[PDB]
Amino acid sequence: GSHMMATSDVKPKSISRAKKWSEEIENLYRFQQAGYRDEIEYKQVKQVAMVDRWPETGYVKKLQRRDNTFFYYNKERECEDKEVHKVKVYVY
């Protein structure tokens, strides 16, 4: 009978396109690049709860990609309007 639906993990409802630059987008870009849809997917991979972030803005300091490689991110805003359009947004 296969397996019931997960209660600890929620799959994305749909995918939209970011309009402007916001912690929601910039973050999604970093995570999406790593191969994750959202922090939720990331946490499951490393089975954690807290993500390394800077107090200045609260951006992700580093994120491991799907290739098992650590990628350093620039807290000093890295996403530009050009990325907003190219960057997609996942909705649950």
From Swiss-Prot:
GO terms for biological process: manchette assembly; meiotic cell cycle; protein localization; sperm axoneme assembly; spermatogenesis. It holds the Pfam family Meiosis_expr. This is Meiosis-expressed gene 1 protein. Interacts with PACRG. Interacts with MORN3. Belongs to the MEIG1 family. Disruption phenotype: Mice are viable, but males are sterile, producing only a few sperm that are morphologically abnormal. Spermatogenesis is dramatically impaired at the stage of elongation and condensation. Spermatozoa exhibit failure of flagellar formation, disorganization of sperm axonemes and deformed heads. One of its GO terms (cellular component) is cytosol. Expressed in the testes (at protein level). Expressed in the ovary. Several isoforms have been identified differing in their 5'-untranslated exons. These isoforms show different tissue expression. Some are expressed in various tissues, including lung, liver, brain, testis, oviduct and oocytes. Some are testis-specific. The lineage of its organism: Eukaryota, Metazoa, Chordata, Craniata, Vertebrata. Essential for spermiogenesis. The keyword Ribosomal protein does not apply. Keywords: Differentiation, Meiosis, Spermatogenesis.
